Ligand binder design. Structure first.
Ligand SMILES: OC[C@H]1O[C@@H](O[C@H]2[C@H](O)[C@@H](O)[C@H](O[C@H]3[C@H](O)[C@@H](O)[C@H](O)O[C@@H]3CO)O[C@@H]2CO)[C@H](O)[C@@H](O)[C@@H]1O
Ligand SMILES: [Ca+2]
Ligand SMILES: [Ca+2]
Length: 167
C-alpha cells in the first residue's frame, strides 16, 4: 500500500504508555493542553484484536480542557501533492458507550482541508472515512484527531489503521 502518513497503525512503536508526546510515536504528534487538569493516558497496546498489525493507540480521557483540540493525536508528517484528492480511513472504538471524536486534516498553517465532525464511537471497531483535496500548494500536511470532548471523560478511545491514500 501507498499511504501518505507514517506508522498509521502504531506498529513501529514499542508497547507502553507514551510520555514523550511530541516524539515518542513515530509519525504522530500527541498534545495535551494545560487546561486539562486530570491528564489523559496515551498507550500503545499490543492486543490480539488490533484491526491492523498487533498494536493500537489507546487514549484514556480522565478529564478535558476548554476545547476539543486540547487532547489530540496528530499524524505528521503527511506527504501529499497539491491539488490531489485523498481518501482518509481510520478504525476506532471505545471502552464504553458514549464517545465522540473528530477526525481532521489540515496544513502546517492549521488551515483545515476537511473533517469528520463529532463522530459517534461505539464499543465495536468501525471504519471512519472521508475524502479531502489539497486545495493549496502544500506538500507536508497533518491529520489532527480531537479527543477532548466532555462526553469522553471516563472512557478510553482506541484508534488504529490510519491510511491516507491517493484517491
Ligand atoms: O499539528 C499539531 C499541533 O496542533 C495544534 O492544534 C491545532 C489543531 O490540530 C487544529 O485542529 C486546529 O485547527 C483549527 C483551525 O486552525 C481553525 O481555522 C478552525 O476554525 O478550527 C480548527 C480546530 O477546531 O488548529 C490548532 C492550532 O491553533 C496544537 O495547538 C499543537 O500543540 C500541535 O503540535
Ligand atoms: Ca495497528
Ligand atoms: Ca512527532
Amino acid at each position: 500500500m501507498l499511504v501518505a502518513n507514517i506508522n498509521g497503525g502504531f506498529e513501529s512503536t514499542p508497547a507502553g504508555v507514551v510520555t514523550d508526546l511530541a516524539e515518542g510515536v513515530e509519525g504522530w504528534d500527541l498534545n495535551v493542553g494545560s487546561s486539562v487538569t486530570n491528564p489523559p493516558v496515551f498507550e500503545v497496546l499490543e492486543t490480539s484484536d488490533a484491526p491492523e498489525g498487533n498494536k493500537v493507540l489507546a487514549v484514556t480521557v480522565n478529564g478535558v480542557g476548554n476545547n476539543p483540540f486540547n487532547i489530540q493525536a496528530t499524524a505528521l508528517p503527511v506527504n501529499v501533492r497539491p491539488g490531489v484528492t485523498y481518501t482518509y480511513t481510520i478504525r476506532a472504538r471505545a471502552e464504553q458507550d458514549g464517545a465522540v471524536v473528530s477526525f481532521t486534516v489540515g496544513n502546517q498553517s492549521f488551515d483545515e482541508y476537511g473533517r469528520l465532525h463529532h463522530q459517534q464511537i461505539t464499543t465495536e471497531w468501525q471504519p471512519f472515512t472521508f475524502e479531502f483535496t489539497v486545495s493549496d500548494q502544500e506538500t507536508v500536511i497533518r491529520a489532527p484527531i480531537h479527543f477532548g470532548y466532555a462526553a469522553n471523560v471516563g472512557n478510553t478511545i482506541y484508534i488504529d489503521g490510519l491510511a491516507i491514500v491517493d484517491l
